Amino acid sequence: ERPTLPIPDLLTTDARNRIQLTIGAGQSTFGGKTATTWGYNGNLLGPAVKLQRGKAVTVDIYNQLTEETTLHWHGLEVPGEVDGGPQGIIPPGGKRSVTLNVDQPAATCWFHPHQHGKTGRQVAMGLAGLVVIEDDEILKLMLPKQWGIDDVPVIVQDKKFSADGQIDYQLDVMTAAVGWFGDTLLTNGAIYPQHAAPRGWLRLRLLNGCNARSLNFATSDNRPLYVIASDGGLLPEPVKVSELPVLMGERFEVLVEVNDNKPFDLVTLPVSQMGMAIAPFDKPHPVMRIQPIAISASGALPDTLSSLPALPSLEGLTVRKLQLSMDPMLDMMGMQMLMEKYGDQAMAGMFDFHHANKINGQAFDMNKPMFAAAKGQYERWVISGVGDMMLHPFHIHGTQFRILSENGKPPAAHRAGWKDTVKVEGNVSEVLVKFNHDAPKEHAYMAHCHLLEHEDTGMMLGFTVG
Ligand SMILES: [Cu+2]
Ligand SMILES: [Cu+2]
Ligand SMILES: [Cu+2]
Ligand SMILES: [Cu+2]
Ligand SMILES: [O-]
Ligand SMILES: [O]
């Protein structure tokens, strides 16, 4: 019998107007074997923090780990001071408080650690949570909204484990090149769970929370997914797709029809990324089973969802060029180890390594922001991965941007709205980006590749705003 899909608690402010998040180590069970894991308000993963546009929420964060961590609100438009990048250190056994002055549209964002050089490991150990932002607009739509019934978060992650059951994380020459990936897929921390969903429309809030693995969602029987939202919020209208690529750290919300009785699976399809199509990921891989039930639901697929502003005119905009690179020795050694271990299937569908990944010729330097961006002004950022064939989902803190061109082409319709991530893979991308909030040298915004092992080995830059 498949375990039921764990549903993260939807966390709102308490009596005192505060939200409390504890970061700690505990135990989880995978395939009948115990493993040390980390979680927010629990042993693994975390809650969904519920925020409202125009309202302030104070979060008290208690680090009960025996090492330093930070807490970053991925997708949130907040000042550098509360961004929780690598400078936002929470001492082990300590507490830091932040006030989130939420001022962006309804969206599914998320939160996770950003410890300098160790973010890959800290996510792999289990730290990730969700953010549900609501506004006046979205609540007027007749979208499915019964949390954990017909409005369901789906955090999809791979891991690998050693024979003793423990999470087998390493940042080594291979993983610094191609990323940390595993052979076991988790859905809100469970292996191939089932979710009982009302007949009618089911809303899934999908997060690719893998360190390095890209995903491609579809249904087992090829029924369509209706995309209603991306990283930064609602699309102007639903986009019908038969499959949905999702890069590391991206979110999409989809609606899917729930028939009367017969179950079906959400699946992920094999991707063309180095290392990611090794069995059992060489074939469609189940993510979770959806089991129809006959209980109350009234969610609908609306004809129109929202209104996007026009892209800003390109004339006069500051252009910033971000050249991603990997030391040729890392690229070659990394690919060699991958090929030697796994053989040709590692390419199906296609010297210190600790500072071998770079932007504009420089591995991340926490003490030296690369540039000062303007506040309240659209800029055009041009991000290139010409020079290697690794996947680089490029993510910029402090903003939700518009993609102008994604890796050689205009963005697909469902990726043309509000995004915090853009694909860079052997080509060049352009985003139109505005920062509404300040970030000083001491608490700078990060712009980085969200393949975490690249990030941890230097593919990140700091920038100030204001
Ligand atoms: Cu972020
Ligand atoms: Cu992130
Ligand atoms: Cu990268
Ligand atoms: Cu980040
Ligand atoms: O991130
Ligand atoms: O992030």
Query: Are both 252 and 369 inside the same structural domain?
Result: no
Strand 445-449 versus strand 392-396 pairing type:
antiparallel
Query: Are both 70 and 204 inside the same structural domain?
Result: no
What's the 123 CA to ligand 6 centre distance in angstroms?
12
- 336's CB contacts (< 8 A; 6+ apart) are none
What's the 88 CA to ligand 4 centre distance in angstroms?
12
- 436's CB contacts (< 8 A; 6+ apart) are 77, 103, 375, 376, 399
This structure's resolution (Å) is 1.9
397 lines ligand 5 (CB under 6 A): no
Q: Look at residue 304 and tell me if it is in a domain.
A: no
Q: Look at residue 341 and tell me if it is in a domain.
A: yes
Which of 371-404 are b and which e, b meaning 16 or more Cβ less than 10 Å from the residue's Cβ?
eebeeeebbbbebbbeebebbbbbbbbbbbbbbb
What's the 103 CA to ligand 2 centre distance in angstroms?
19
List the strands of the sheet with 244-246, edge to edge: 194-198, 285-293, 264-268, 215-219, 244-246
At CA 108, angle to CA 241 and CA 423, rounded to 5?
A: 55
Bridge partners, residue 397, by sequence: none
Query: Are both 344 and 392 inside the same structural domain?
Result: yes
Give the number of the ligand closest to the Cα of residue 209: 2
Nearest CA to ligand 6 atom 1: 74
Work out the burial of residue 325: count CB atoms within 10 Å of its CB; fewer than 13 is exposed, 13-18 middle, 19 or more buried: buried
118 lines ligand 6 (CB under 6 A): no
Q: Look at residue 239 and tell me if it is in a domain.
A: yes
Residue 341: what are its φ and ψ, rounded to 5°?
Answer: -70, -50
Q: Look at residue 342 and tell me if it is in a domain.
A: yes
Query: Are both 140 and 150 inside the same structural domain?
Result: no
450 is in an annotated binding site: yes
What's the 220 CA to ligand 5 centre distance in angstroms?
31
392 lines ligand 6 (CB under 6 A): no
Query: Are both 171 and 84 inside the same structural domain?
Result: no
Q: How far apart are CA 184 and CA 210, in angstroms?
A: 11
Give the number of the ligand closest to the Cα of residue 250: 2
Query: Are both 132 and 106 inside the same structural domain?
Result: yes
Segments forming the whole domain that contains residue 128:
1-145
Domains held by the chain: number: 3
CB 436 within 8 A of CB 375: yes
- Helix H, strand E, coil C: the string for the chain is CCCECCCCCEECCCCCCEEEEEEEEEEEEECCEEEEEEEECCCCECCEEEEECCCEEEEEEEECCCCCECCEEECCCCCHHHHCCCCCCECCCCEEEEEEECCCCCEEEEEECCCCCCHHHHHHCCCCEEEEEECHHHHHCCCCCCECCCEEEEEEEEECECCCCCECCCCCHHHHHHCCCCCEEEECCECCCEEEEECEEEEEEEEECCCCCCEEEEECCCCCEEEEEECCEEEEEEEEECCEEECCCCEEEEEEEECCCCCEEEEECCCCCCCCCCCCCCCCEEEEEEEEECCCCCCCCCCCCCCCCCCCCCCCCCEEEEEEEECHHHHHHHHHHHHHHHHHHHHCCCCCHHHCEEECCECCCCCCCCEEECCCCCEEEEEECCCCCCCEEEEECCCCEEEEEECCECCCHHHCCCECEEEECCCEEEEEECCCCCECHHHCEEEEECCHHHHHCCCEEEEEEC
**Cis amide leading into 411 (omega within 30):** no
Query: How many residues would you count in the chain?
Result: 466
Calculated CA dihedral for residues 115, 373, 111, 11, nearest 10 degrees? 140
Q: Look at residue 242 and tell me if it is in a domain.
A: yes
At CA 215, angle to CA 38 and CA 7, rounded to 5?
A: 45
Query: Are both 196 and 135 inside the same structural domain?
Result: no
Residue with tokens 């964060």: 61
Query: Are both 111 and 189 inside the same structural domain?
Result: no
395 lines ligand 6 (CB under 6 A): yes
Work out the burial of residue 27: count CB atoms within 10 Å of its CB; fewer than 13 is exposed, 13-18 middle, 19 or more buried: exposed
Give the number of the ligand closest to the Cα of residue 459: 3
285 is in an annotated binding site: no
195 lines ligand 5 (CB under 6 A): no
Method of structure determination: X-ray
449 is in an annotated binding site: yes
Give the number of the ligand closest to the Cα of residue 322: 3
443 is in an annotated binding site: no
Which of 93-116 are b and which e, b meaning 16 or more Cβ less than 10 Å from the residue's Cβ?
eeebebebebbbbbbbbbbbbbbe
What's the 350 CA to ligand 2 centre distance in angstroms?
26
72 is in an annotated binding site: yes
Nearest to 324 by CA among 389, 397, 264, 380: 389
What's the 109 CA to ligand 4 centre distance in angstroms?
12
112 is in an annotated binding site: yes
Query: Are both 451 and 331 inside the same structural domain?
Result: yes
What's the 300 CA to ligand 6 centre distance in angstroms?
32
What's the 402 CA to ligand 4 centre distance in angstroms?
18
CATH number of the domain to which 357 belongs: 2.60.40.420
Q: How far apart are CA 396 and CA 297, in angstroms?
A: 37
Q: Look at residue 309 and tell me if it is in a domain.
A: no
392 is in an annotated binding site: yes
Nearest to 369 by CA among 306, 461, 303, 241: 461
Give the number of the ligand closest to the Cα of residue 462: 4
Query: Are both 194 and 232 inside the same structural domain?
Result: yes
Work out the burial of residue 162: count CB atoms within 10 Å of its CB; fewer than 13 is exposed, 13-18 middle, 19 or more buried: exposed
Q: Look at residue 32 and tell me if it is in a domain.
A: yes
Strand 107-112 versus strand 129-134 pairing type:
antiparallel
Q: From its phi and psi, is residue 48 left (phi > 0), alpha (psi between -120 and 50) or beta?
A: beta
- 408's CB contacts (< 8 A; 6+ apart) are 427, 428
Paired tokens of 50: 């519920």
72 lines ligand 6 (CB under 6 A): yes
72 lines ligand 5 (CB under 6 A): yes
74 lines ligand 6 (CB under 6 A): yes
Query: Are both 255 and 360 inside the same structural domain?
Result: no
74 lines ligand 5 (CB under 6 A): yes
Give the up-direction half-sphere exposure of residue 287: CA atoms within 13 A in the CB hemisphere.
Answer: 22
- 93's CB contacts (< 8 A; 6+ apart) are 63, 64, 66
397 is in an annotated binding site: yes
Query: Are both 150 and 127 inside the same structural domain?
Result: no
What's the 240 CA to ligand 6 centre distance in angstroms?
28
Q: How far apart are CA 339 and CA 373, in angstroms?
A: 41
- Span between the terminal Cα atoms of the chain, in Å: 55
Residue finishing a domain among 298, 333, 353: 298
Side chain identity at 27, as an amino acid letter? Q
454 is in an annotated binding site: yes
Q: How far apart are CA 270 and CA 288, in angstroms?
A: 16
Q: Look at residue 332 and tell me if it is in a domain.
A: yes
- 16's CB contacts (< 8 A; 6+ apart) are none
